[PDB]
Amino acid sequence: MPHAFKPGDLVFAKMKGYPHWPARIDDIADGAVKPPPNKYPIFFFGTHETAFLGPKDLFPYDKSKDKYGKPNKRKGFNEGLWEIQNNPHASYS
């Protein structure tokens, strides 16, 4: 059975106006800005941008990849598909 989301989990994350996007739940480094309550720090692969999202916008990657894991014209998307499949836990800083 599912647990709550934790750092390192792989997802497609949904933002208004964007396709479901390959991403991970990030850690929050000591001294780093914390998300709002009930929000997670989401790192989006390919763009390497961060937003704060709650679970309603988070789709576990294994369950969802057949639906959402297809190329897209949007900037950074296809790079992001490579990253989530091939090195999802690397430093992209």
Swiss-Prot record:
Tissue: Widely expressed. High expression is found in heart, skeletal muscle, ovary and testis. Overexpression is frequently observed in hepatocellular carcinoma samples.
Gene designation per UniProt: HDGFL2
Protein source organism: Homo sapiens (Human)
Residues included from the entire protein: 1 to 93 of 671
Signal peptide: none
Family in the record: Belongs to the HDGF family.
Domain of life (superkingdom): Eukaryota
SUBUNIT field: Interacts with HDGF. Interacts with trimethylated 'Lys-36' of histone H3 (H3K36me3). Interacts with trimethylated 'Lys-79' of histone H3 (H3K79me3), but has higher affinity for H3K36me3. Interacts with IWS1. Interacts with H2AX, POGZ, RBBP8 and CBX1. Interacts with histones H3K9me3, H3K27me3 and H3K36me2. Interacts with DPF3a (isoform 2 of DPF3/BAF45C). Interacts with SMARCA4/BRG1/BAF190A, SMARCC1/BAF155 and SMARCD1/BAF60A in a DPF3a-dependent manner.
Domain PWWP stretches: 7-64
Biological function: Acts as an epigenetic regulator of myogenesis in cooperation with DPF3a (isoform 2 of DPF3/BAF45C). Associates with the BAF complex via its interaction with DPF3a and HDGFL2-DPF3a activate myogenic genes by increasing chromatin accessibility through recruitment of SMARCA4/BRG1/BAF190A (ATPase subunit of the BAF complex) to myogenic gene promoters. Promotes the repair of DNA double-strand breaks (DSBs) through the homologous recombination pathway by facilitating the recruitment of the DNA endonuclease RBBP8 to the DSBs.
Localisation: Nucleus; Cytoplasm
Protein name, as recorded: Hepatoma-derived growth factor-related protein 2
